[PDB]
């Protein structure tokens, strides 16, 4: 099952990115190093 999801910045709790993942293939919340425009630097973004 593939679903749209939002990657929220851990540092600022900002929902910067939209993406999608397959729940079965990635049961755990996705985490990526993505640029946070508010903080203007790369931070850890975790799915919510």
């Amino acid at each position: 099952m593939r679903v749209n999801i939002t990657l929220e910045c851990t540092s600022c709790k900002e929902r910067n990115y939209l993406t999608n993942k397959n729940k079965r293939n990635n049961p755990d919340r996705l985490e990526k190093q993505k640029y946070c425009p508010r903080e203007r630097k790369v931070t850890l973004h975790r799915e919510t």
């Binding site: 099952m1 729940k23 079965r24 049961p27 755990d28």
Partner: protein, 534 residues
């Protein structure tokens, strides 16, 4: 206690879906559900250990006494007294308070305000948890369950499963709580100890939520029964006892089933007419017209047609021995054993099993039942005597505390065997209700009941002719227990079993019972009650 729009989904397998529940104060609520239903998870939400993905869970401000389903032993060397003392925050605050005093000497006029406030709260909190408890706890053991003081200085990890349950139960009471969250409070207790727990819980004036698979135990205490559904991922709360819940529930599913039947009939009726028009001659204009008109009704019906919930599948066990039993599967002769520093459990113990025999090792908590079984397997080497297994005897061991699983590995990895291919493993795991990617789950996240199925699956896959089972029905939901007992009854091999569950032993049909500590190889009968009384 109130929960609204509760949602919770671990990965791909969901627990709650728009679930709701309201529990009034002073309600002895009996929480019921199959293994994995999410009963333990509910307490974690109440304890704020978990957070709902969506929805609100509301808890009162009162202090909560939590009895975990699994004993929490932070360190192996912890003593029973240390474990119990940790129930109260007396020790923790004193260590903090002692540091506050150190800071007061170091700091003159900078942090005094913060330190003084912290000291004041600790003193007021310490007095609130009156430091006289040191004496009260010592006598709480005596009045609670006749817990001997020799255990009081013994490492907790060395206690027996029944003994551990008493300590954990006493620790909850020692904390002096306001709401009782009991997760299987009688998992390993013997008949006598269960009596005390029942009486105390009947008298307990406050609210107590009980997760239990013992129907009789709940019926004596429960006034409200909360059922966690495994298929609908919802919560339903009934007034009454376990039987009342079953009566109300069975009727509701019956009335729901009849509704779905009639909706299907009407759909079939329309479908049958639509087909009749579909195959009629193109020259029959009116029938063709009516066929399209009914096709519209058929579509609207099929879109409002309730789906019948898939009935939760029950476990299927087919245990068969690879080889054949001998007339003397196991020979125990003049076996004596004592744990270094403790009294001898048995002296010159000698028994001989016959083959395809139901052998019950009776006793009470902390009497050596699990020690004897460990003795047979080879975990414990006998201090004296010999234990001989016939070369025709293959042995399968079910430990009491579920110590045969790797928490770090997955379900499939645990059951991996050199003698079985992958699809063979999956088929059996499906018979144990582990479907598809449920087998890739780490054993560390499973409930005790689901883990018990994995241990049983390992026992089944051995295809041994001798089964050494130590409380097999423990942690199992009532439905799975009856399946376990019924299938063992038909097992064509020797069974050495330990069980404090009267129903399970009856299904197995015991032949000879071995009483402890007074070694007595006896024919099985309702005289078992006589030994229990004496």
């Amino acid at each position: 206690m109130r929960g609204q729009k509760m949602n919770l989904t671990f990965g791909l397998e969901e627990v709650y879906e728009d679930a709701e529940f309201h529990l009034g104060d002073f309600d002895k609520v009996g929480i019921v559900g199959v293994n994995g239903a999410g009963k333990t998870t509910l307490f974690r939400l109440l304890l704020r250990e978990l957070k709902l993905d969506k929805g609100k869970i509301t808890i009162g401000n009162s202090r909560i006494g939590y009895l975990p389903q699994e004993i929490i032993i932070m360190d192996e060397k912890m003593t029973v007294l240390e474990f119990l003392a940790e129930g109260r925050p007396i020790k923790k605050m004193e260590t903090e308070l002692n540091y506050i005093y150190e800071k007061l000497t170091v700091v003159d006029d900078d942090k005094q305000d913060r330190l003084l406030k912290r000291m004041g709260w600790l003193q007021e909190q310490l007095e609130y948890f009156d430091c006289y408890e040191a004496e009260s706890i010592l006598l709480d053991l005596v009045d609670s369950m006749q817990i001997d003081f020799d255990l009081f200085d013994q490492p907790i990890s060395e206690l027996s499963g029944g003994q551990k349950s008493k300590i954990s139960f006493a620790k909850v009471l020692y904390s002096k709580p306001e709401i009782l969250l009991l997760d299987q409070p009688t998992n390993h207790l013997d008949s006598s100890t269960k009596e005390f727990v029942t009486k105390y819980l009947k008298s307990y004036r406050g609210s107590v939520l009980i997760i239990s698979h013992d129907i009789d135990f709940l019926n004596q205490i429960i006034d409200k029964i909360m059922y966690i559904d495994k298929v609908t991922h919802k919560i339903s709360i009934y007034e009454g006892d376990y039987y009342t819940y079953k009566k109300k529930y069975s009727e509701n599913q019956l009335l729901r089933e009849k509704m779905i039947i009639q909706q299907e009939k009407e759909v079939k009726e329309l479908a049958t007419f639509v087909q009749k028009a579909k195959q009629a001659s193109q020259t029959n204009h009116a029938l063709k017209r009516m066929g399209l008109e009914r096709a519209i009704r058929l579509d609207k019906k099929k879109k409002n047609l309730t789906k019948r919930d898939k009935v939760y599948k029950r476990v299927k066990m087919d245990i068969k021995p690879n080889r054949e039993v001998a007339r003397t599967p196991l020979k125990v002769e003049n076996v004596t054993f004592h744990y270094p520093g403790h009294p001898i459990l048995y002296k010159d113990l000698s028994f001989q099993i016959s083959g395809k025999e139901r052998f019950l090792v009776v006793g009470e908590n902390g009497v050596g039942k699990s020690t004897l079984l460990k003795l047979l397997m080879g975990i414990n080497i006998p201090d004296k005597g010999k234990i001989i297994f016939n070369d025709k005897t293959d042995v399968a061991y079910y430990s009491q505390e579920l110590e045969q699983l790797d928490e770090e590995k997955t379900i499939l990895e645990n059951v991996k065997s050199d003698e079985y291919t992958d699809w063979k493993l999956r088929a059996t795991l499906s018979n144990f209700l582990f479907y598809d990617d449920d087998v890739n789950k780490k054993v560390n996240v499973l409930s005790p009941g689901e883990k018990a199925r994995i241990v049983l699956c390992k026992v089944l896959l051995q295809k041994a002719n001798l089964l050494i089972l130590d409380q097999p029905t423990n942690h199992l939901d009532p439905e799975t227990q009856s399946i376990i007992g019924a299938n063992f009854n038909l097992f064509e091999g020797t069974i050495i079993v330990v069980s404090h569950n009267p129903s399970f032993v009856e299904q197995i049909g015991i032949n000879r019972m071995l009483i402890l500590p007074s070694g007595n190889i006896d024919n099985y009968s309702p005289e078992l009650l006589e030994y229990y009384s004496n």
